[PDB]
Amino acid sequence: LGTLVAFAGGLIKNPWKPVVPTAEGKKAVLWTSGWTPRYQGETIYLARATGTEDGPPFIKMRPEDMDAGGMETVFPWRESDGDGTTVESHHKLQEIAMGIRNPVMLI
Amino acid sequence: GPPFIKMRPEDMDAGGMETVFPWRESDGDGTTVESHHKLQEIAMGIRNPVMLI
Amino acid sequence: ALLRTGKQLFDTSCVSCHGANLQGVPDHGPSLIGVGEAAVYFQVSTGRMPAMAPRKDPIFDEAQIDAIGAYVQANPTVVRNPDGSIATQSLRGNDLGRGGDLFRLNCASCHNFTGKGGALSSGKYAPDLAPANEQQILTAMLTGPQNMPKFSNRQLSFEAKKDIIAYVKVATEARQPGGYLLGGFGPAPEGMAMWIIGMVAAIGLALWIGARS
Amino acid sequence: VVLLITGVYLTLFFDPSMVDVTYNGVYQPLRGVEMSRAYQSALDISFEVRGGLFVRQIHHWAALMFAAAIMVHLARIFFTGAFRRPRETNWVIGSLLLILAMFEGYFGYS
Amino acid sequence: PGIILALIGLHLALVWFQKHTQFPGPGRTEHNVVGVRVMPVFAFKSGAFFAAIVG
Ligand SMILES: CC(C)=CCC/C(C)=C/CC/C(C)=C\CC/C(C)=C/CC/C(C)=C/CC/C(C)=C/CC/C(C)=C/CC/C(C)=C/CC/C(C)=C/CC1=C(C)C(=O)c2ccccc2C1=O
Numbered sequence: 001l002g003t004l005v006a007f008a009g010g011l012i013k014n015p016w017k018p019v020v021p022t023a024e025g026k027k028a029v030l031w032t033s034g035w036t037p038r039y040q041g042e043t044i045y046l047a048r049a050t051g052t053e054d055g056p057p058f059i060k061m062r063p064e065d066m067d068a069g070g071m072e073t074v075f076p077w078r079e080s081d082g083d084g085t086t087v088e089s090h091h092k093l094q095e096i097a098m099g100i101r102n103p104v105m106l107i
Numbered sequence: 108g109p110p111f112i113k114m115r116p117e118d119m120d121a122g123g124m125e126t127v128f129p130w131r132e133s134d135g136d137g138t139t140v141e142s143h144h145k146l147q148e149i150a151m152g153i154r155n156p157v158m159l160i
Numbered sequence: 161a162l163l164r165t166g167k168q169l170f171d172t173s174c175v176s177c178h179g180a181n182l183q184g185v186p187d188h189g190p191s192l193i194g195v196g197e198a199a200v201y202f203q204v205s206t207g208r209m210p211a212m213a214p215r216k217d218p219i220f221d222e223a224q225i226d227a228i229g230a231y232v233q234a235n236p237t238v239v240r241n242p243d244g245s246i247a248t249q250s251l252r253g254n255d256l257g258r259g260g261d262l263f264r265l266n267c268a269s270c271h272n273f274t275g276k277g278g279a280l281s282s283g284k285y286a287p288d289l290a291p292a293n294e295q296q297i298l299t300a301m302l303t304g305p306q307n308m309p310k311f312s313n314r315q316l317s318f319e320a321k322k323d324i325i326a327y328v329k330v331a332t333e334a335r336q337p338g339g340y341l342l343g344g345f346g347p348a349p350e351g352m353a354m355w356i357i358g359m360v361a362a363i364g365l366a367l368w369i370g371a372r373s
Numbered sequence: 374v375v376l377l378i379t380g381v382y383l384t385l386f387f388d389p390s391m392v393d394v395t396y397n398g399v400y401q402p403l404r405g406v407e408m409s410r411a412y413q414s415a416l417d418i419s420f421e422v423r424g425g426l427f428v429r430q431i432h433h434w435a436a437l438m439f440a441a442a443i444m445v446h447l448a449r450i451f452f453t454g455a456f457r458r459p460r461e462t463n464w465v466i467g468s469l470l471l472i473l474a475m476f477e478g479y480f481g482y483s
Numbered sequence: 484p485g486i487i488l489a490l491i492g493l494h495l496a497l498v499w500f501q502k503h504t505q506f507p508g509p510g511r512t513e514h515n516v517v518g519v520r521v522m523p524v525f526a527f528k529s530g531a532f533f534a535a536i537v538g
Pocket residue numbers: 348351352355356444445447448451
């Protein structure tokens with residue numbers, strides 16, 4: 001019993017421990033999205049992807065940048081991430097891009 | 108910003124040894140991703156390091 | 161004389177559907193006010209126009225179409241060459257990777273990884289992208305035909321559109337380096353080919369080598 | 374047996390990492406795209422090793438033939454009754470082999 | 484792969500030591516095996532089938 005527990009105990013992780021910082025404390029990953037506010041009043045833009053790496057891979061959106069029959073995929077911008085020129089900003093934008101609950105359909 | 112800085116003759120004493128690498132201005136400081144990669148390729152080279160005494 | 165020849169050609173075959181002032185019959189046709197010459201070019205050249213809807217041969221041929229387009233615009237334009245012809249190779253772009261990312265994000269959900277067809281709900285489907293030219297692709301994504309979202313030029317820039325056009329024209333006409341393309345879809349044709357070729361040949365070899373009774 | 378040989382070959386070129394990189398390879402329609410190290414390793418096997426595409430296609434076809442042959446053999450055993458009293462344990466072993474092959478192929482093409 | 488190799492070994496060992504089944508026929512009985520011996524014929528046929536499948 002001892003050896004079985006010590007051999008299988010390194011894989012087990014608690015899914016409900018609070019690790020994600022939000023505006024109301026720390027929450028468990030499976031309850032947060034990336035659209036979750038962080039400091040009680042932060043502006044999170046609906047940014048769209050450009051598919052290029054010139055300076056921005058995410059640009060803001062104005063209401064007149066679409067027609068009455070279009071659909072756009074948007075992500076959370078959070079201006080403090082900046083365009084991806086520095087390595088830090090590039091990493092922030094990449095963690096924006098690789099999030100399973102990030103994409104949103106705007107019609 | 109800099110992982111590599113230039114050298115002048117007076118930046119050393121008569122009993123000093125220093126490891127030096129090839130700079131090539133066009134690499135710049137490692138602020139952008141391309142320059143970061145250039146500097147990484149400088150640092151990971153098996154015939155790059157030079158001993159200056 | 162373009163506006164004149166356009167109206168006469170329109171009043172003969174188009175007023176029946178949409179209207180005398182191009183405002184839309186409540187039962188027959190849509191409004192057609194805000195649409196430009198690009199919608200007229202696409203819908204007519206692809207033969208989808210005058211109808212009672214797959215692609216077919218166009219009835220008006222490259223001059224009547226331009227006249228009708230100018231007329232409808234006079235009450236999104238097509239791209240032309242500096243000599244007045246419609247652009248064919250000018251619409252290709254040079255950033256194939258960007259074009260492919262944009263295609264997989266915006267377009268591949270309905271057509272395919274490589275522009276094959278797709279099934280939609282309750283009848284309708286998305287066609288194959290092989291028989292379309294560059295101007296037709298441009299006008300398609302500019303006007304947004306039935307059940308296809310309309311991609312404004314402000315949400316998808318002209319350069320991004322040109323990159324997407326280059327990517328689809330490469331993905332539709334490049335030779336496969338691995339043998340016979342089994343339909344462009346995934347492992348369903350591959351499992352079919354397995355069961356029909358490999359297992360049949362193996363079982364025939366077993367029948368030849370072994371005995372039976 | 375063919376799966377074993379071709380997999381041993383394939384292990385000399387694969388890097389199973391999820392760290393991200395930019396392609397900058399020979400397949401131009403993907404130049405400049407952010408990918409993982411595993412996807413780039415598979416693209417390299419396909420496009421820059423002389424024979425790698427051939428070998429991995431042999432590998433995938435051998436996997437499909439493996440599964441189909443196992444199913445046809447199970448059909449023969451079941452319909453002829455070769456699973457009765459003396460050979461029930463061998464029936465059980467074959468069933469375990471079938472489950473294992475299913476999951477091994479699933480992990481393979483991922 | 485290791486587990487599958489071990490199970491295939493045990494499977495083939497059981498098939499080898501519990502002799503094979505056969506269909507009812509003229510000279511066939513619940514107590515004998517009618518067929519061909521390994522050495523000249525069975526190994527030849529098995530190797531030829533292996534080569535054909537690889538092909
Ligand atoms: C015979 C056996 C199934 C009996 C099991 C007894 C039963 C009590 C066990 C419990 C299992 C439960 C209760 C239900 C089982 C149903 C299912 C969920 C089982 C999961 C896996 C299962 C064990 C696989 C068995 C399937 C079966 C044994 C395959 C044998 C097929 C036959 C005998 C091959 C003969 C040669 C063949 C016909 C040559 C022509 C090719 C034809 C068209 C193959 C048909 C065909 C096949 C078979 C495809 O798999 C396929 C996949 C993708 C695309 C197309 C095809 C396709 O066309």
